[PDB]
Write a protein that binds this DNA or RNA. Structure first.
Ligand SMILES: [Mg+2]
Lengths: 82, 107, 17, 98, 95, 98, 87, 107, 95
DNA sequence: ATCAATATCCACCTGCAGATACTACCAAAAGTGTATTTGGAAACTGCTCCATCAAAAGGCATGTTCAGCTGATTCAGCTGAACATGCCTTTTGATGGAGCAGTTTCCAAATACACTTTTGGTAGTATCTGCAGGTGGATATTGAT
DNA sequence: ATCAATATCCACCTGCAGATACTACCAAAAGTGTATTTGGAAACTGCTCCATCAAAAGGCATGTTCAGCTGAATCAGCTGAACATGCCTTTTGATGGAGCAGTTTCCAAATACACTTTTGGTAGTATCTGCAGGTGGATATTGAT
C-alpha cells in the first residue's frame, strides 16, 4: 500500500498546524496547497543547508548547516546552535 | 594579582571572551578598550530583561524551571522584545493564545 | 536584580486583536 | 446519542493546540520527506538527528504563521473558511512570490 | 573531546540575580545562547559598518553605542545604553 | 457637455502614471515635511539636496508598493475601492506591524 | 541672527491629489475618503523611521549635514535598499 | 612587460580594485589569489546580463541612451534579476504597466 | 577634488561589448554602480561568513563560488560560476 | 426551563528524566613590557546649502451632480465538521560502521616590504548630439442616442 | 451603428542639457619580484552517533449525515468620480553669506604584539528533584428537550 512521501504530511497533521494558527474552518483544497508551500520551504532551506555541507567537504548535514540556512532565508532559529 | 575585566566592570558576562570574539570576527583591525565592556553590558542587560519576564511567565504556570514556552510568552507579550526578535523562531516556544473575535460561537 | 530594567512594558497592538 | 455542533470541537482544538508546543507532524513521514528533497541536491547524505528537528521546528513555525496571515485574509473577505486564495494572497504580500 | 564554549555560565548567573528561586531547561538555555550570539552578531555587524563608513580602523565604545541605538527599539535602547555607559564608567574607575 | 463615466479617467490615470517615473509629490512640501521631522529629532540640521531626493524616491516607491498590496487586499474582499482596513491588512502581512 | 521659521503641519502638504497619483501608479481605480489621512500617517511613520536612522549616522559622524549616504545607509538598514545616490 | 591581472584573466572588470576592496572591507584575515579574479568575473557577467536587457528596453522605446526606466523594465521583466533585486528600489525607474483584470470595464 | 573612484569605466566597456551603438545616462550609470557595489558586498559577506563558519581565515575562489551559489538564483548562478571558473583557470594558466 | 453527556478543573502522588553540583586539567584571559598606529586639536579652504525674492505655469481647493459601488438582506445548495472503528503506520528501543573531528606535519600560497610603472580620476575645454518639449494634424476611444 | 466630443498618437522641429571625448597629467594604486610567514589540505584512526531493523502502540483513512457557511441575486442609499471654476503656492533661476564639511600635519594616547603567569570555564562525572504523567471526584459547558 505505497504512496508519496509528501502525502505523508497528512490532512489531520495539516489541520493541527492550522488550529495552532487559530483557523476554525478549512476548505478541502487547503491540504494540497499546504503540501505545495511546505515542499518549496524545505526545497529552499535544504538546498542552502546542503550547499554548506558540500562546502565543508562532509557527507552529513549538521544542525548548523540548517541553522545557517534558515538564517539567510530570513527564518533565524534559536536553540540548535549559533 | 589578577582581576577579570568583568569583575572590574561589574558584569557576570565575559568582557574577556567578548573582546576575543570581536577580534576573531573581522569586524575591524583594532578594538577600543571599552567596546567589549559596553557590548558585554548590553548582552547582560538584554538577558536580564528576557530572564526577568520569562521568570514572571514561569511563575504564572506554577513553575520554578523556565522552559522555551516561558521565553516565547515573555518575548511576544513585549512590544519591544517582540520587534527586536520579529524574524526569530523560538524552538519549542509555540504561540500566544489568540482567537479572532468573529470565530467565537454566538451563544 | 541589580539591573536598570524597564519600569513599564507594553503589549504590541495586534491587527484583529 | 449526543453530537457536538460544527466548529465547537474546532475552537477546542484551537485552544488545545495554542496552549501546547509539541511538533504536530509525525517525525518519520517528515524525515522521509527531508531525505527525499535532499537526495535531489546530493546523494548518499546523512542527517544529524538535531539537523532534522531544527528543520521540523522551522518548517512547522513557518506554516503556523502562514495559517495566521491566511486566516486574516479569509476573515478580511468576510469568511471563516481558509481557502487557497487566502494562502496565495498571504504569500504574495509577504513577498514569497508574484 | 575538545572545548565547546557557550554563554550558559553567564545566563545562569543573571537568572539568579533576577529570579534566585528559578531554574532553566537545557532547551531554554539553548535559546538564550542563540539569543546572545544573534544580538552579538547584529551589534558587532552594525559597529563594523559604522567604523567602515567613517573610514575608521577601530570599533570603540562609541560604535557599540550607535549600533545599539540603530538596533534596539525605544526603551530597550535607552536602558541598554545606560547599563552600557555604567559598566564602562565602573571599569575606567578600577586601579 | 459629455461626461466620462466613473472609472474611465481613473484607468486613464493608471495608464499615464504607470508609464512614467516623475515624482508625484510636490518637491517643496516634501522638503518641509523632511525638515520638520528631522528638526523634531535634532535642531540645527541641514540636508544635501540629494539626501532629500533619496528620501523622496524611497517614500514614493514605498507608497506605490503599499498601494499595489492594498489594492490586492480590496479585490480579495471583492471590492475595487481601497479603504484603510486594506492598508492595515497589507502592512500586517508585510510584517511592518503586529 | 534670523532663527528658523516654525515648521508645523507640513504633513498636510501631501495633498489628496499627490496621494491619488501615487495610488494610480499603484494601479488603484477607486479610493475611500478615509485613505488620505491613513496614507499621511503611514508616510509620517516611514519618514520618521528612515530620518531617525539617517540622523543617527550624521550625529555619529559628528556632522551638522544629513548626506545622501546617511539616507542610503538608513534605507539599507530598513530593508528598503535604494540605487542611484551612491554606495 | 607590465600585465594587469584583469588582462591576465580576460576581464574588463578591475581585479586589482576588487582585491583591495576585499582587503579594506575586513571580510577575512587573508585573501586567495583566485578570489578577486572570480568575483570580478561574476560582477562583470551580471553587469553584462543587465546591460544586454536594458539595451533592448532602450531600443524597444525608440531610444539610444539607457536611462533608469530601461534598467527597471529589464530587471522587473526577468524572473531571475527580479528575485536578485526584489528588495531594491531603482531611483527614477517607475513600475511595470499592470492593471488587475477585475478593474477593466464592461462584460 | 579628492579622487572618488567608481566602476563606470568598466560598466561602459561592457555596455560597448553587448550594444555597441548604445549610451547610458549618468543616473543609469549611478544605478549600475550601486548594483555592482551591492552584489560585491552580498558575495564578500556570504564568503566572509562561510570562511568563519569553517574556522578558515582565507577567502578563496572556493568561498566566492559557494557565496554565488547561495546568493544568485538558478541560471545566473550557473553562468556566473562558469565565467568565474574560466577567468580563474585562465589567470592561473597565464603565468 | 430540565437533563445528561462530555469536557474541564484541581488536589494529591511519585518515578526518573533531566536538572544541579563537584572536580582536575588546560586553553585562553590577564599581566608586563616594548612595538606601532590613530584619531582628535588646530588651522585653513572652497563647496554647497540656506535665505530670500520676483514672475508665472500649474496644480490645488471647493462645490455641484449623479453613476454605480458597497454592503445589507435573503436564501438554496454543497461542502466541510463531526464522529465510530480496526489496521496500518509510526514509535520505541537495541546493534554494526560511516564519517566527523581530532591532530601533526610540511609545502604551496599568502603576507610584508619597497621598489617601478601605469591606471583611472579630474579639471579644464571643447565638442557633439540625443531627446524633451513643443506643435499640428491625422486617428482612436468613449458615451449619448 | 451613428456621431461628436475629446483624448492619443506620431511624425516634425528645434535648442540645449547632458553626453561624449579630447587632452595632458598626476597622484595613488596596481604591479613586480624576492624575503618571510603559515594556513590548510593530507593522511591517519577512534569513537560518536547515524542508519538500519525488528517488537510495542496509538493515530489516521474511511464513508455517512447534515449544520451552517459561502456566494448568488437584488436593491437602495450615499460615497466617491468627474469636472468646472477661482486662485494660492510651487517651480525656477537667479544672488550673496557662511556654515561646515573636508584636508592635511603633530603627535600623546591608545591598542597591538610577544612572552609569561594564572585561573575561569569546560568535560567528564556524581548526585538531587521538578514536574508529567497518572488517579479521583467535583463542576462547568454544551446541546438535546
Ligand atoms: Mg517641530
Amino acid at each position: 500500500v505505497l504512496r508519496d512521501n509528501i502525502q505523508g504530511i497528512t490532512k489531520p497533521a495539516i489541520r493541527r498546524l492550522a488550529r495552532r494558527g487559530g483557523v476554525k474552518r478549512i476548505s478541502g483544497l487547503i491540504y494540497e496547497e499546504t503540501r505545495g508551500v511546505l515542499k518549496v520551504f524545505l526545497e529552499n532551506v535544504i538546498r542552502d543547508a546542503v550547499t554548506y555541507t558540500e562546502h565543508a567537504k562532509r557527507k552529513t548535514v549538521t544542525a548548523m548547516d540548517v541553522v545557517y540556512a534558515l538564517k539567510r532565508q530570513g527564518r533565524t532559529l534559536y536553540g540548535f546552535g549559533g | 594579582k589578577a582581576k577579570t575585566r568583568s569583575s572590574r566592570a561589574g558584569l557576570q558576562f565575559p568582557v574577556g571572551r567578548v573582546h576575543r570574539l570581536l577580534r576573531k570576527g573581522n569586524y575591524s583591525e583594532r578594538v577600543g578598550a571599552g567596546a567589549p565592556v559596553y557590548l558585554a553590558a548590553v548582552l547582560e542587560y538584554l538577558t536580564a530583561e528576557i530572564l526577568e519576564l520569562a521568570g514572571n511567565a514561569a511563575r504564572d504556570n506554577k513553575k520554578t524551571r523556565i522552559i522555551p514556552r516561558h521565553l516565547q510568552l515573555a518575548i511576544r507579550n513585549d512590544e519591544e522584545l517582540n520587534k527586536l526578535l520579529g524574524r526569530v523562531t523560538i524552538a519549542q516556544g509555540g504561540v500566544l493564545p489568540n482567537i479572532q473575535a468573529v470565530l467565537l460561537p454566538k451563544k | 536584580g541589580g539591573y536598570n530594567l524597564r519600569p513599564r512594558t507594553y503589549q504590541p497592538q495586534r491587527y484583529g486583536g | 446519542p449526543h453530537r457536538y455542533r460544527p466548529g465547537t470541537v474546532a475552537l477546542r482544538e484551537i485552544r488545545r493546540y495554542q496552549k501546547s508546543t509539541e511538533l504536530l507532524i509525525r517525525k518519520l513521514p517528515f524525515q522521509r520527506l527531508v531525505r527525499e528533497i535532499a537526495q535531489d541536491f546530493k546523494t548518499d547524505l546523512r542527517f544529524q538527528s538535531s539537523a532534522v528537528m531544527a528543520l521540523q521546528e522551522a518548517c512547522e513555525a513557518y506554516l503556523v504563521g502562514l495559517f495566521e496571515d491566511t486566516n486574516l485574509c479569509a476573515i478580511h473577505a468576510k469568511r471563516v473558511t481558509i481557502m487557497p486564495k487566502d494562502i496565495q494572497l498571504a504569500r504574495r504580500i509577504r513577498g514569497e512570490r508574484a | 573531546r575538545s572545548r565547546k564554549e557557550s554563554y550558559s555560565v553567564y545566563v545562569y548567573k543573571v537568572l539568579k540575580q533576577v529570579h534566585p528561586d528559578t531554574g532553566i531547561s537545557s532547551k531554554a538555555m539553548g535559546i538564550m545562547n542563540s539569543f546572545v550570539n544573534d544580538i552579538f552578531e547584529r551589534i558587532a555587524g552594525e559597529a563594523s559598518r559604522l567604523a567602515h563608513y567613517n573610514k575608521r580602523s577601530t570599533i570603540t565604545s562609541r560604535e557599540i553605542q550607535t549600533a545599539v541605538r540603530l538596533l534596539l527599539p525605544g526603551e530597550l535602547a535607552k536602558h541598554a545604553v545606560s547599563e552600557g555607559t555604567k559598566a564602562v564608567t565602573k571599569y575606567t574607575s578600577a586601579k
